[PDB]
Amino acid sequence: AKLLEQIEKWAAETPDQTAFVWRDAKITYKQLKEDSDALAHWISSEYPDDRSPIMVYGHMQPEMIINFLGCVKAGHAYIPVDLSIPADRVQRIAENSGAKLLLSATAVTVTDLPVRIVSEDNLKDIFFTHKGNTPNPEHAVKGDENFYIIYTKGVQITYNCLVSFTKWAVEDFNLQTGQVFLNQAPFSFDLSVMDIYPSLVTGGTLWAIDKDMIARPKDLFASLEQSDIQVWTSTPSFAEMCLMEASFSESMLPNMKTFLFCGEVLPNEVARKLIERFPKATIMNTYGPTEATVAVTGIHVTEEVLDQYKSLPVGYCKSDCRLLIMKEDGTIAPDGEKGEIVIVGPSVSVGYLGSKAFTMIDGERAYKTGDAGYVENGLLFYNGIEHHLRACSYVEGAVIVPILLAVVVPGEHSFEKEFKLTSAIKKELNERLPNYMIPRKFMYQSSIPMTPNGKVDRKKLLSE
């Protein structure tokens, strides 16, 4: 049925089941339906014909999801804005997007925004004032109408784009029903969509972790231990950070069944370690730009895949879409050859809000990713040494950053001086790589730093 119908179905079938939980704050499918219905009814009464996007500001409060649903149920696309987004950027969105309203799941800090701000208590008053009211079914966003706009430039993701992505994920990733889904990515990062919607349409439970938790491993693991998470969606880096914890394995999350990765490169070793620690789980690696609705390719990372590849492939393209590897010139690269990845089909966004990259191919929307890659027998390899670096002795983790800078988290070793560990690693690397490919500069860290979205913090590494 409809995306929204698929969700409300659970409000009827399992009304008391938790739809979302953040620390002590929880909301059941019934509460989600009531409050989002209340919000939507209010939005419609306040804005009779306006259908401008609506900003939803906060971090991990349940009201984030409630607001998302209220906006779309009233025919307005929501624009998620996490607290970690820089104030001037938030302001630029306030002017760029054309939004006239902002709903807050906390205390709005970014002062003076050219938009009507509906704070936390003002938000509670509307859930109360419109309690029991339901929105006009015809107001719900549909077809090629915007559902959400996530900034990267505001990427317009339609109802049809989301549906195309959500059905593929639930079906191909073999998600059940009633499973607990981890949410690590802030909502301002579309990776979050890979868990939010497949969970809501399958009656799962979203277990959100937050910034403060991540900054305190004891807190993070305490939460994970009680989560009973079954479907883990995060960036490779966040999982790698969790793997540094020796107790992060099956015994901690006995019911883990599906790891879903996207956002950056998933190291072969990381995937191998996950497999060793969670023998009952299936690991899925995926790829896609924000402009193609979260992800378009996917592949089950098996022992086989780990063995025949060094850098892991990013998968097979969902069939209602297609990938084209383009050499410099509208000429398609022969299979196996490198070129720019181009995506075409229903997952492709309708374009940047306002305002090169979007085009039309064979009558369908297409997007030039600006990403290099190549395909072999339908298998996509994404290309933006690290694999060989990670495999070296004394290296427990590493990332290569082109300025080439090798950043490595050293494991136990016996070297008294840094330059001696560096020479040893280089000597080892020279065994599998020509000398000119070995990074000149090496830097050591206790751990690879991540941005608030969970990706490798390149900027920070360069600054250091």
Numbering used by the authors: 1 to 152, 160 to 362, 368 to 396, 414 to 432, 441 to 501
What's written in the study?
The longest such disordered region is between Arg-397 and Glu-413, which contains the inter-domain hinge residue Asp-399, interacts with β-phosphate of ATP, and forms the pantetheine channel. Asp-399, equivalent to Asp-398 in BsDltA, serves as the hinge residue for domain rotation. This structural feature of BcDltA likely explains the relatively low sub-millimolar affinity for ATP, since part of the stabilizing BcDltA-ATP interactions would be used to compensate the cost of establishing the adenylation conformation of the protein.
The D-alanyl carrier protein ligase DltA, as a remote homolog of acyl-(coenzyme A) (CoA) synthetase, cycles through two active conformations for the catalysis of adenylation and subsequent thiolation of D-alanine (D-Ala). D-alanylation brings in positively charged amino-groups and partially neutralizes the net negative charges of the phosphate groups on the lipoteichoic acid backbone.
